[PDB]
Amino acid sequence: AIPSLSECQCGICMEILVEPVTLPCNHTLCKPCFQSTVEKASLCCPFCRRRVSSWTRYHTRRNSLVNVELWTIIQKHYPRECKLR
């Protein structure tokens, strides 16, 4: 099955996901929101409140924050929504 556009939008800024980060707590949100949170927020996942600092370091070293499957699926389904930015 395919999730709808209403569900896939970022849970923080109500926007379409922008190369999101897949957290170990199985939470997905757009990369600008994640960078803002790690830069100046509590450095914890907003939903279930579990810090991801070590995993963040491990994936930042390898540049694996982006989840390319979500990018490909969202751009093949909805080019216009991504292109309007």
Partner: protein, 148 residues
Amino acid sequence: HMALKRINKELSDLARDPPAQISAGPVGDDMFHWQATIMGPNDSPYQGGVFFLTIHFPTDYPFKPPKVAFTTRIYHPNINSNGSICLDILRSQWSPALTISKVLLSIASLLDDPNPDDPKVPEIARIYKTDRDKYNRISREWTQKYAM
């Protein structure tokens, strides 16, 4: 930008889903500054208590916690005279997932039953913890003399 659209969506959500015992709105043309009113819960010594409060919104939300203040000088075991509010949601457990409806309902719940584990004003905290009756009817006398 993102903040303005977020505030607009929050306003639309609270309008289409009004909360309980409270109401809120934009005081002026500027979307950042906000006003609200709350009614004293019936299962409390706050009978006949209407309270006006103001909300100041920073340049980003819900990225940063908004500022809350009580325009009406109302007695409370964990609230100062000038309106200073000691809420662990406000400055410690604040998260971007939290919305304005969530924080208003949380503060309403705190007014329903205050938490004395981390008192703001120790003297009235120990007044409350000593016995119920004097605290109850003294809170009643302020909430009648001030709110009404």
